[PDB]
């Protein structure tokens, strides 16, 4: 199951200064980018146009171009009506797209956050405030719903365009979406954090797709004190992850980091702490120091 996401970032500094930038994602892969300075939507993959014809794409760009312009005019005018009068800076974020399910099943969404707080959603045929949203937003919403051409366009974008586009996008970029990128692992140690203890770090990088398994082992015994870190992105559209183990002095012996990932094909990365492969890696990764931790 995949989720197609159009992430719009709008920032208003004053009655003259504004900026609207968008990024598009199909899962964890970037498909498009539309920066304020660029008049057209730019493709970030060879398959970003999907199975749309050049005429089809042009028609879509033209309306998006009209939208960006009109959206700036519309907000700048709704800022005057908003209370308290002109609360600059104004941060509007828009999250629109569709989630694909097996068959012809799909579910579209359009969510809006004002000052980083989710306030409005497009639901069915109208724009609506979400529970908790500030009561002053009800009037600009009533005003927004008066635009018959906007509600009709949003309805076609969400109901038809989005799933139809994504269907062809998944087909066009399947090779790139189903790519298997092999992880690479390495070890390190730091004196953190309690006295007489040493933290053992297991670095895992360059794996795709996202799901992994990284565990510190003492033979077949899974060491319960393993702290898995967050998934950190790499520029080449791969992933980085690390697992830490806090151990007393001398307890390092017999420990090993085990890495399980889809691209490996059953041939798990096993790095033995103390081993010649480990000494030979340590030897080329040295630096001049003493350790500091902020976390």
């Amino acid at each position, epitope marked *: 199951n995949y989720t197609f996401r159009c992430l719009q970032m709008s920032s208003f500094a004053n009655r003259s200064w504004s900026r609207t930038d968008s990024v598009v994602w199909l899962g964890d892969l970037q498909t498009h980018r539309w920066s304020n300075d660029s008049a057209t939507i730019s493709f970030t993959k060879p398959w970003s146009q999907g199975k749309l014809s050049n005429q*089809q794409w042009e*028609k*879509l760009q*033209h*309306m998006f171009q*009209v939208y960006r312009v009109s959206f700036t005019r519309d907000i700048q005018e709704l800022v005057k009506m908003m209370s308290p009068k002109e609360d600059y800076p104004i941060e509007i974020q828009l999250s629109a797209g569709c989630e694909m399910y097996p068959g012809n099943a799909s579910e579209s969404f359009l969510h809006v956050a004002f000052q980083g707080k989710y306030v409005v959603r497009f639901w069915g*045929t109208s724009w609506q405030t979400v529970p908790g949203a500030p009561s002053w937003l009800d009037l600009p919403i009533k005003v927004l719903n008066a635009d*018959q*051409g906007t509600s*009709a*366009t949003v*309805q*076609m974008l969400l109901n*038809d*365009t989005c799933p*139809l586009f994504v269907r062809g996008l998944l087909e066009a970029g399947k090779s790139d979406l189903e790519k298997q990128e092999k992880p690479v692992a390495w070890l390190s140690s730091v004196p953190s954090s309690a006295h007489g203890h040493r933290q053992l770090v297991c670095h895992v990088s360059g794996f795709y797709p996202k799901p992994v398994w990284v565990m510190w082992m003492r033979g077949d015994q899974e060491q319960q004190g393993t702290h898995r870190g967050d998934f950190l992105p790499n520029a080449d559209e791969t992933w980085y992850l690390q697992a830490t183990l806090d151990v007393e002095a001398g307890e390092e012996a017999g420990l090993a980091c085990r890495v399980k990932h889809s691209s490996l094909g059953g041939q798990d990365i096993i790095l033995y702490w103390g081993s010649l492969h480990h000494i030979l890696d340590a030897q080329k990764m040295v630096w001049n120091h003493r350790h500091h931790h902020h976390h």
Partner: T-cell receptor
Framework: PKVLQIPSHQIIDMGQMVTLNCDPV?????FYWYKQILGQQMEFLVN????????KSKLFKDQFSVERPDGSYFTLKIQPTALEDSAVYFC????????????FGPGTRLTVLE | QKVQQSPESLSVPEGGMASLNCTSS?????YFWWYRQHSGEGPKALM?????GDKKEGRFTAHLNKASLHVSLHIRDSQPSDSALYFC?????????????FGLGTRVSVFP
């Protein structure tokens, strides 16, 4: 707030060049031309936006030319003219290219005679 | 034909009722518009109808059933002002720059 067309009626001889003027609604972006035969069948001809043709029907011959220069009417030229071109030509403008109301003009009654 | 309309012509008494029917032959041409042209003038859109069900605009209601590609128009309390040529236009699904696909139209005559 209304699409205007000059002239109301026009009588032209075969082969001659004819220009059908249209003043769309202010603030409208997408412009159209329709052909209506005997006050019955309404036929789409051309969609014009951003200074270029966005869509054209099979009825839009090589004789037909469409343009909108800055500060002048959205026009439709017919060169050369044929007897079959005798119809009512409708100008239309909308805020959008699709799913929004198209505003029609009074039309120009073109009459190409032998 | 792409947009089939019925009847060819209809005659309704003043204050009476008139039902107009319209069917699309193409599954992509599922979004409808009801236009009305008074003899010797440019047509005026009555209403759009893009979602299934009824859309009531005063004396006028348009019903849609995308499943069966059928759209209809119901006129209540027919007035002489309603005597015109009623057009059913269809818009192609997921196409942001396109013309209108008009049917042959229904000639409605409100008689006293």
């Amino acid at each position: 707030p209304k699409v205007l067309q000059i002239p109301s009626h026009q009588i032209i001889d075969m082969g001659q060049m004819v220009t059908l003027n249209c003043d769309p609604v202010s603030n409208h972006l997408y412009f159209y031309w329709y052909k209506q035969i005997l006050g019955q069948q309404m036929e789409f001809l051309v969609n014009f936006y951003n200074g270029k043709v966005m869509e054209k029907s099979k009825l839009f011959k090589d004789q037909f030319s469409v343009e909108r220069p800055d500060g002048s009417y959205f026009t439709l030229k017919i060169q050369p003219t044929a007897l079959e071109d005798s119809a009512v030509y409708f100008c239309a403008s909308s805020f959008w290219g699709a799913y929004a109301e198209q505003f029609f003009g009074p039309g120009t009654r073109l009459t190409v005679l032998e | 034909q792409k947009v089939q309309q019925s009847p060819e012509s209809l005659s309704v008494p003043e204050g009476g009722m008139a039902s107009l029917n319209c069917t699309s032959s193409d599954r992509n041409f599922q979004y409808f518009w009801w236009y009305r042209q008074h003899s010797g003038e440019g047509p005026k859109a009555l209403m759009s109808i893009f979602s299934d069900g009824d859309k009531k605009e005063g004396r006028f209601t348009a019903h849609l059933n995308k499943a069966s590609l059928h759209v209809s128009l119901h006129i209540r309390d027919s007035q002489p002002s309603d005597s015109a040529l009623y057009f059913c236009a269809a818009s192609e699904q997921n196409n942001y720059a396109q013309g209108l696909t008009f049917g042959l139209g229904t000639r409605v005559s409100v008689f006293p």
